[PDB]
């Protein structure tokens, strides 16, 4: 039962996410991606090497590429969630509420799978943008990038695998205290099942890991704080960068966050 | 032209797959038997097992609660119907909820005509029939919301649509481009235009002698928006003046501004 619950989550994870942490770790080690570290390498990458509103500047273009990856990951998270036991049994408005307040927590957790202390895989791992180059971007666009590296480095130290992350992201999405949730008891019930499955799974998968389950619970609290700060940065970019576009899907997500 | 016939058939199959009651099944029941509910005693009989919730209050509120129940179940079926429609599922989930939020009541009142005649209304999968006169005898403001639906339904049933017609008509109601807060307006308008073209084509083949049928149905869509507007006003009065009466949570989200 509880193994069948976890296996179903793991299969929905492998089915709906093109880039897994296993595939990504093979690329980042050497089992090669074009390194993007300045304007010239980025232009070459955008000229067919690796791969939107009109080109404004270098920092805004990268900002636009960040939005694009979010839109694509929301599509995958929506299909992943719809393959979760009794997520589809929720009314559609509750499904949207869980995705609205959960996608960025899940996105920032899954970014760790394609991130190291030096940079980030882009476009199915065919490219690799460096942390140094992303730091060099203009403000406020550089402000939204570095905190994700800091979280991802410490999160990768826990050495979770795809089977772990499948339950971890499922627990992020099915969160009982999202604002405006209609059927809170049902969501809390599903969440409690996922957390039990997660603890059960971590026992077999990481028998030597000390305090791993409460460590992951703390990571979930960290992710909510990371998203709150990110949402405030995004709202200031919306205020101060009036010529910079925001994808309509992201506009609906950040509308009421404070 | 060739894609339209297949597009229509796919929508009809989604109709037959997801709705508990069709107009074909309903009209055969209404012509010959359902237990007739016409007063308090028959209604109690129906609840005790002959035919079939928040805590009881009174008879008019109990019928009001059963009205909410049929809406909740029809929203479930309309959501599965819409999800089987071409390119509805391709919209982001928040656009799907917006279309359903502002469309389900227009579609519900259109589909209500299938189980209504001038004398009353089928209930509980057609095993019951509640009379129009009994529903009229309920306490205001609860009897206020019932009678205009009969009035719309009898005039709507005069058009003599069948289920294949209604499948496209319901799809056009849901895929409405001017719903408040719609994100991808051009994509919804494009899907609606395809449905309206499929509907026009379908009406020519299925009702070859029917005059002005397609613009009549477009007018019915406008009538349905006015019917829902007046209904929401009446629901606001019930929410204001009947404070002891509960409103199902799904309906609170639909009627929230
Ligand atoms: C791990 C470093 C931080 O990355 C991110 C930080 C924040 C967000 C949240 C978004 C921001 C709009 C949201 O609010 O939705 C997303 C990312 C993901 N970035 C990318 O995938 C990316 C970056 C650069 C390139 C390029 F090649 F162009 F350089 C291509 C892809
Ligand atoms: C054609 C008559 C009008 O019916 C309706 C009017 C308005 C709405 C919209 C709702 C109102 C809360 C909403 O706002 O969502 C729904 C219905 C559907 N009624 C029923 O199916 C029904 C009625 C009575 C019984 C009983 F036998 F118990 F008496 C059982 C079922
Ligand atoms: C089952 C589909 C039909 C559901 C219709 C009800 C939709 O309600 C709306 O759901 C949204 C959350 O997604 C909220 O943001 C809105 O405030 C709310 O009004
Ligand atoms: C693609 C799934 C994840 C996207 C989440 C986007 C959430 O947007 C919300 O959609 C609701 C209608 O559904 C509106 O009522 C809210 O105002 C809006 O904030």
Swiss-Prot record, chain A:
This is Peroxisome proliferator-activated receptor delta. One of its GO terms (biological process) is negative regulation of smooth muscle cell proliferation. Ubiquitous with maximal levels in placenta and skeletal muscle. The keyword DNA-binding applies. The keyword RNA-binding does not apply. Residues 34-256 form the NR LBD domain. GO terms for cellular component: chromatin; nucleoplasm; nucleus. 'Lys-48'-linked polyubiquitinated; leading to proteasomal degradation. Deubiquitinated and stabilized by OTUD3. Keywords: Activator, DNA-binding, Metal-binding, Nucleus, Receptor, Transcription, Transcription regulation, Ubl conjugation, Zinc, Zinc-finger. It is found in: Nucleus. Ligand-activated transcription factor key mediator of energy metabolism in adipose tissues. Receptor that binds peroxisome proliferators such as hypolipidemic drugs and fatty acids. Has a preference for poly-unsaturated fatty acids, such as gamma-linoleic acid and eicosapentanoic acid. Once activated by a ligand, the receptor binds to promoter elements of target genes. Regulates the peroxisomal beta-oxidation pathway of fatty acids. Functions as transcription activator for the acyl-CoA oxidase gene. Decreases expression of NPC1L1 once activated by a ligand. The gene is PPARD. Heterodimer with the retinoid X receptor. Interacts (via domain NR LBD) with CRY1 and CRY2 in a ligand-dependent manner. Belongs to the nuclear hormone receptor family. NR1 subfamily. One of its GO terms (molecular function) is DNA binding.
């Amino acid at each position: 039962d509880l193994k069948a619950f976890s296996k179903h989550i793991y299969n929905a994870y492998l089915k709906n996410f093109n880039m897994t942490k296993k595939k990504a770790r093979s690329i980042l080690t050497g089992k090669a991606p074009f390194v993007i570290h300045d304007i010239e390498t980025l232009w070459q990458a955008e000229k067919g090497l690796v791969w939107l509103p009109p080109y404004k500047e270098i920092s805004v273009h990268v900002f636009y590429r960040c939005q694009c990856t979010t839109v694509e990951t929301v599509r995958e998270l929506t299909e992943f969630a719809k393959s979760i036991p009794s997520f589809s049994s929720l009314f559609l408005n509750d499904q949207v509420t869980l995705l609205k307040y959960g996608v960025h927590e899940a996105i920032f957790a899954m970014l760790a799978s394609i991130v190291n202390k030096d940079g980030l895989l882009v476009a199915n791992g065919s490219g690799f943008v460096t942390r140094e180059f992303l730091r060099s971007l203009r403000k406020p666009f550089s402000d939204i990038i570095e905190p994700k590296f800091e979280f991802a480095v410490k999160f990768n130290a826990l050495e979770l695998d795809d089977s772990d992350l499948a339950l971890f992201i499922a627990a992020i999405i099915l969160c009982g205290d999202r604002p405006g949730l209609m059927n809170v008891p049902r969501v809390e019930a599903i969440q409690d099942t996922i957390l039990r499955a997660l603890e059960f799974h971590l026992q077999a998968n990481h028998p030597d890991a000390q305090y791993l389950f409460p460590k992951l619970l703390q990571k979930m609290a960290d992710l909510r704080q990371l998203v709150t700060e990110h949402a405030q940065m995004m709202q200031r970019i919306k205020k101060t960068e009036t010529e910079t576009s925001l994808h309509p899907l992201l506009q609906e997500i950040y509308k009421d966050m404070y």
